[PDB]
């Protein structure tokens, strides 16, 4: 009888916790589909604008924090770039000063953006992108991000949807790992 | 012209967040400042004890420092800034899990042998011009994924990439995003 009642309580959390887990797991397959999706319309569009506005280069910077290749680096070479209509001046790391001509070079472009290694924690890199996520509101928004060009809110979208992709795939791990054990737990005391 | 300063920018980032705590956060996200921040100051950071996972990407700084007064970092995330070396990282080697750091000026990986924990290094876009670095490097004994794409010794290879990269580390189980493949070790083996 204890049995069974430790084995109904871990099933109520297990069915509450699956539910939250499938809710994860739909999101996890719309962001996948987001970067997966925009396929090389976006990179071709990057690639066809050539010199790409300073708002367009920080949406590029969060793509290359994730490539992890010749970052720009604690402020050298940056200074203030007014957005839109509005003077202000606004305090980053600035864009890679040949980065991008050695990314643009490479015909692997689309190779690489294609394909990402799954349940990636990714946990230096969001640090590194942990700043660009507090200011992402000023630049990253979708809004600013369509009026520099129709493709550099896509490269920023894409960004966005890689991040939104693999905190999908950290809860999915974690959450669902505590329902797991609960759910091995239930099975080991079902057999019993 | 010492444009940024953290303290600014963290006061910004502390009311943006808008939590009533300056060090109860987990994922701390000081990422694209405007203005970038330039150079981090340890004392400053220091107060961030809860956190795991610092974003600091998208700035302009240029030096690692303050690794010391921090208890709970496991991601450190600084893409897309200046950083030339590999340095005072001993104050969070023993959390450190992942190093976040594509984009930069890298072009030594002297220093990072002494990141012990370190499971994932993404330093995509860097300088990197032998292979020199990763016998350094291969002293990481929990070292699984790893992202060399846009590296200049990447380019003077002149072999795929994905399976150079399965051959020069046998400890990686994904490289430049690619998860391990029988057919890949096959060929890395044939190579």
């Known amino acids: 009888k204890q049995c069974e009642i430790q084995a109904e309580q871990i099933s109520k959390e297990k069915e509450e916790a699956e539910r939250e887990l499938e809710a994860a797991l739909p999101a996890l397959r719309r962001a996948q589909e987001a970067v997966d999706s925009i396929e090389s319309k976006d990179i071709v569009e990057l690639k066809a604008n050539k010199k790409p506005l300073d708002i367009i280069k920080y949406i590029m910077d969060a793509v290359l924090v994730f490539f992890k290749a010749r970052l720009i680096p604690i402020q050298i070479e940056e200074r203030v770039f007014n957005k839109k209509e509005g003077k202000a001046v606004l305090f980053l790391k600035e864009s890679y000063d040949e980065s991008g001509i050695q990314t643009l070079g490479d015909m692997n472009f689309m190779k690489k953006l294609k394909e990402f290694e799954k349940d990636s924690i990714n946990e230096e890199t969001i640090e590194l992108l942990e700043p660009y996520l507090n200011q992402s509101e000023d630049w990253f928004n979708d809004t600013f991000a369509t009026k520099a060009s129709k493709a550099a809110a896509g490269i920023l979208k894409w960004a966005f949807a890689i991040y939104e992709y693999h905190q999908k795939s950290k809860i999915v791990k974690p959450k669902r790992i505590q329902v797991a054990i609960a759910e091995g737990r239930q099975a080991i005391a079902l057999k019993e | ?191």
């Open chain 2, 1 to 191: 012209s010492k444009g940024t300063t953290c303290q600014k920018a963290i006061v910004n980032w502390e009311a943006a967040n808008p939590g009533k705590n300056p060090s109860e956060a987990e994922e701390i996200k000081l990422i694209f400042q405007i203005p970038p921040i330039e150079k981090m100051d340890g004392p400053v950071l220091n107060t961030l004890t809860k956190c795991k996972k610092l974003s600091l990407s998208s700035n302009s700084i240029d030096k690692m420092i303050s690794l010391n007064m921090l208890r709970n970092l496991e991601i450190l995330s600084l893409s897309r800034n200046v950083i030339k070396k590999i340095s005072g990282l001993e104050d969070i080697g023993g959390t450190l899990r992942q190093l976040w750091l594509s984009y930069n000026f890298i072009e030594k990986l002297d220093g990072l042998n002494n990141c012990s924990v370190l499971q994932t290094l993404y330093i995509g876009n860097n300088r990197i011009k032998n292979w020199e670095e990763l016998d350094k490097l291969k002293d990481l004994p929990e070292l699984e994924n790893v992202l060399f794409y846009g590296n200049p010794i990447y380019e003077q290879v002149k072999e795929d990439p994905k399976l150079i990269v399965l051959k020069k580390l046998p400890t990686l189980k994904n490289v430049d995003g690619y998860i391990i493949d029988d057919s890949v070790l096959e060929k890395v083996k044939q190579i």
